[PDB]
């Protein structure tokens, strides 16, 4: 799957903000526009350790941004379920999305 992170106009949005993948299918998040963004998965209170580890590995560090230099990031989630992700700098600006893994 592919997700666009941001746009050329400066909106704090993922495009699309909902995607469905098959287990093992990578999601490639690629920056669009000049505004830096990142992507980090929410880890539910509740999630088993294996799922928490998957989600951490599928997340950028909060000290990391996509740029024209490093334009993309690839996330792989094996556990079927629905997951929410967000952008660290624009988290409060409601820059978020969902991933369903079949
Ligand atoms: Cu952002």
Swiss-Prot record:
Co-factor requirement: Cu(2+)
Predominant location: plastid
Annotated residues for binding of Cu cation: 37, 87, 90, 95
GO CC list: chloroplast thylakoid membrane
Annotated GO MF terms: copper ion binding; electron transfer activity
Coiled coil: none
Protein name: Plastocyanin
UniProt organism field: Dryopteris crassirhizoma
Name of the coding gene: PETE
């Amino acid at each position: 799957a592919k997700v666009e992170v941001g746009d050329e106009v400066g909106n704090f949005k993922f495009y699309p903000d909902s995607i469905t993948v098959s287990a093992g299918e990578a999601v490639e998040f690629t920056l669009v526009g000049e505004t830096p963004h990142n992507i980090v998965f929410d880890i539910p209170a509740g999630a088993p350790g294996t799922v928490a580890s998957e989600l951490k590995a599928a997340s950028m560090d909060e000290n990391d941004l996509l740029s024209e230099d490093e334009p993309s990031f690839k996330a792989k989630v094996s556990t079927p379920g629905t997951y929410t992700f967000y952008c660290t700098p624009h988290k409060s600006a409601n820059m978020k999305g969902t991933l369903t893994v079949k």
